[PDB]
Design an enzyme around this catalytic site. Structure first.
Site, PDB file in Angstrom:
ATOM      1  N   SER A  26       0.803  -1.224   0.000  1.00  0.00           N
ATOM      2  CA  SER A  26       0.000   0.000   0.000  1.00  0.00           C
ATOM      3  C   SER A  26       0.845   1.288   0.000  1.00  0.00           C
ATOM      4  CB  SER A  26      -0.952   0.020   1.208  1.00  0.00           C
ATOM      5  OG  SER A  26      -1.904  -1.035   1.169  1.00  0.00           O
ATOM      6  N   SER A 104       2.385  -7.232   1.407  1.00  0.00           N
ATOM      7  CA  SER A 104       1.225  -6.592   2.038  1.00  0.00           C
ATOM      8  C   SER A 104      -0.071  -6.710   1.194  1.00  0.00           C
ATOM      9  CB  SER A 104       1.601  -5.133   2.327  1.00  0.00           C
ATOM     10  OG  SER A 104       0.804  -4.572   3.350  1.00  0.00           O
ATOM     11  N   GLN A 105      -0.753  -5.604   0.869  1.00  0.00           N
ATOM     12  CA  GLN A 105      -1.965  -5.703   0.030  1.00  0.00           C
ATOM     13  C   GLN A 105      -1.625  -6.445  -1.261  1.00  0.00           C
ATOM     14  OE1 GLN A 105      -5.406  -2.969  -2.407  1.00  0.00           O
ATOM     15  NE2 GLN A 105      -4.073  -1.951  -0.897  1.00  0.00           N
ATOM     16  N   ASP A 159       4.637  -8.851  13.302  1.00  0.00           N
ATOM     17  CA  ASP A 159       3.927  -8.230  12.176  1.00  0.00           C
ATOM     18  C   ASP A 159       2.443  -8.626  12.341  1.00  0.00           C
ATOM     19  OD1 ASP A 159       2.859  -7.243   9.848  1.00  0.00           O
ATOM     20  OD2 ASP A 159       4.349  -8.125   8.504  1.00  0.00           O
ATOM     21  N   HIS A 172       6.539  -4.967  10.132  1.00  0.00           N
ATOM     22  CA  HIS A 172       5.917  -5.000   8.793  1.00  0.00           C
ATOM     23  C   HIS A 172       6.792  -4.285   7.751  1.00  0.00           C
ATOM     24  CE1 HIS A 172       2.613  -5.757   6.024  1.00  0.00           C
ATOM     25  NE2 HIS A 172       2.436  -4.478   5.759  1.00  0.00           N
TER      26      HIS A 172
END
Length: 197
Positions: A26, A104-105, A159, A172
Site C-alpha cells: 500500500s 502486504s496488500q 507483524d 511490517h
C-alpha cells in the site's frame, strides 16, 4: 529502480525464459515499491539481463490503503488487472516459466488473482513469494488452489497483519534483508527445479 514493464514492453519474438510478476504494498511508488528492485538485481545476476523479464502490477491497481478492508483484501479492479497480466504472459510467451510475488496488500492481490485464474495458466507459476501476507491467518498460510511446495511466506514475529489484524507495526517494514537474499535464492531454486541446466 521502481518501475519495470519488461513484459508489456517486451518483444514476442525475443521472449525471456523467465517472467516475474510482482505486486507492491500500500502507498508504494512505481509498480515495484521498496522490495521489488532488490529481488530484481539478484535475478539479473543469476539469469542475465536478457534471461529474465521483471513486470510490476500497475494500471488499475492503485494500492489504496482502505481497500485492505474489502472482502478479498483488495479491489475487484486490481484482481482483474493482475489476472490480465498472467493471461498476457501466457499468450505472448507460451514457453516461459512464470514466478510471482507480492508484499502486504500486494500479497492478498497475488493470492486472489492466482485463485481465480484458469487452471492451465496457474500451473505455469513455478514459485510465489509473499512478504507480510494480510490473509495469512484466514487462508492458513496458503494460496487457495495452489501447492504449498511452490509457496514461500515471510511473516516476521510482531507483524500484526500475519495474525488476522489490519494494524501496521515496525516489523511490517523490515523485509529488506529477506528480499536481498533468501527470497531470490528460493525463486532461483524453483526455476532451476523445472527448467534445469
Amino acid at each position: 529502480r521502481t518501475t519495470r514493464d519488461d513484459l508489456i514492453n517486451g518483444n514476442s519474438a525475443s521472449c525471456a525464459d523467465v517472467i516475474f510478476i510482482y505486486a507492491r504494498g500500500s502507498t508504494e511508488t512505481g509498480n515495484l515499491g521498496t522490495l521489488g528492485p532488490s529481488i530484481a538485481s539478484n535475478l539479473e545476476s543469476a539469469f542475465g539481463k536478457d534471461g529474465v523479464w521483471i513486470q510490476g502490477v500497475g494500471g488499475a491497481y492503485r494500492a489504496t490503503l482502505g481497500d485492505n478492508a474489502l472482502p478479498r483484501g483488495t479491489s475487484s479492479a486490481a484482481i482483474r488487472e493482475m489476472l490480465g497480466l498472467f493471461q498476457q504472459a501466457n499468450t505472448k510467451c507460451p514457453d516461459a516459466t512464470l514466478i510471482a510475488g507480492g508484499y502486504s496488500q500486494g500479497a492478498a492481490l497475488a493470492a486472489a488473482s492466482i485463485e481465480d485464474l484458469d487452471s492451465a495458466i496457474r500451473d505455469k507459476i513455478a514459485g510465489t513469494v509473499l512478504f507480510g501476507y494480510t490473509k495469512n491467518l484466514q487462508n492458513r498460510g496458503r494460496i487457495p488452489n495452489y501447492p504449498a511446495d511452490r509457496t514461500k511466506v515471510f511473516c516476521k514475529t510482531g507483524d500484526l497483519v500475519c495474525t488476522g489484524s489490519l494494524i501496521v507495526a515496525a516489523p511490517h517494514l523490515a523485509y529488506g534483508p529477506d528480499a536481498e537474499g533468501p527470497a531470490p535464492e528460493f525463486l532461483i531454486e524453483k526455476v532451476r527445479a523445472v527448467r534445469g541446466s
